[PDB]
Design a protein around this ligand. Structure first.
Ligand SMILES: *[C@@H]1O[C@H](CO)[C@@H](O[C@@H]2O[C@H](CO)[C@@H](O)[C@H](O)[C@H]2NC(C)=O)[C@H](O)[C@H]1NC(C)=O
Ligand SMILES: [Cl-]
Ligand SMILES: [Zn+2]
Ligand SMILES: [Zn+2]
Length: 301
């Protein structure tokens, strides 16, 4: 059982970090990331895209001056490796931000074009940019936050959550102490919402998640985003948060829209960067920042 703050504790600090978010950084990474023919987890394509992503993560670390922050691959039985970046804090209580890094063309997995721009390139560059801004905080970069923060870039999600399955099963076996896990998977498609006359929102998924953490996630969005929430269910274990839930860890999941208004282009050649609304992924950047910072600095977790 894990419990959370009732209201945000660091509004001033987080609002100031939010000003350092740079909308252009999403596109600058997402454009070449989605130019891999696909990022299929069984393919040398997915191996190369994971290596490319690791270099982009490393560039941010080396640029940050954060001496103790690392990124390391996590090997699987398939060629594409997951990536775990760690910001060590004073305790081993760990906050995880997740996204998956593979893409797939369901009709032609090995050879088909799969730009995976919304699914899940949008979530990758969302948490990548929040990671960079988090490292501009001197306390975080010094290793001085109460809690440890990890950023997970899961391989093989399109095979059935295969990378996050390997990671959380190992974490569980080694008694890793994950106090919160936020998954972000598809953060850029708003056309489904606005086409129907609805206002742009953050979708909160309420199945296969922890009730207390999900309530905390709504607190984060109400404080640090400028668009409202909408609750939705997917009806199955639709992303890597379900791997955390499977091993008892508290997980939550923020989404681009109500589930029925999400991108109809996923898992095909049509999931392109032209479908992504970078003002919306900026809202997901704000919530990733606030979620990570508020929980990194919660002693009673
Ligand atoms: C977090 O801080 C922001 C300021 O950065 C607060 O927003 C301000 O609210 C007061 C109320 O009148 C005014 O100074 C401005 O209207 C707001 N400023 C901006 C830039 O929006 C915000 O209310 C705080 N939120 C929480 C939850 O504490
Ligand atoms: Cl999906
Ligand atoms: Zn996905
Ligand atoms: Zn998918």
């Amino acid at each position: 059982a894990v419990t959370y703050p009732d209201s945000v504790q660091h509004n001033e600090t987080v609002q100031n970090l939010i000003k350092s978010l740079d909308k252009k950084n999403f596109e600058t990474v997402l454009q070449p990331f989605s130019e891999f023919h696909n990022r299929y987890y069984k393919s040398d394509n997915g191996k190369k895209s994971s290596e490319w992503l690791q270099g982009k993560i490393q560039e941010i670390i080396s640029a940050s001056g954060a001496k103790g922050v690392t990124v390391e691959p996590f090997k699987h039985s398939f060629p594409q490796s997951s990536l775990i970046a760690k910001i060590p804090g004073k305790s081993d209580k760990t906050i995880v931000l997740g996204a998956h890094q593979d893409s797939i063309n369901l009709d032609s997995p090995s050879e088909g074009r799969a730009p995976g721009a919304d699914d899940d390139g949008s979530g990758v560059v969302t948490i990548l940019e929040a990671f960079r801004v988090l490292l501009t905080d001197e306390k975080v970069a010094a290793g001085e936050a109460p809690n440890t923060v990890e950023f997970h870039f899961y391989a093989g999600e399109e095979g059935g959550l295969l990378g996050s399955q390997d990671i959380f099963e190992q974490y569980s076996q080694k008694s890793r102490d994950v106090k919160a896990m936020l998954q972000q998977d598809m953060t850029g498609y708003t056309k489904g919402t606005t086409d129907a006359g609805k206002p742009e929102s953050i979708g909160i998924i309420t199945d296969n998640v922890d009730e207390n953490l999900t309530k905390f996630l709504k607190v984060i969005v109400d404080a640090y985003c400028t668009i409202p929430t909408v609750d939705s269910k997917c009806g199955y274990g639709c992303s890597d948060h379900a791997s955390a839930t499977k091993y008892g860890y508290p997980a939550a999941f923020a989404f681009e829209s109500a589930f029925g208004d999400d991108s109809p282009y996923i898992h095909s050649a049509d999931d392109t960067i032209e479908t992504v609304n970078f003002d919306h992924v900026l809202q997901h950047g704000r919530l990733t920042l606030g979620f990570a910072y508020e929980l990194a600095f919660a002693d009673s977790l």
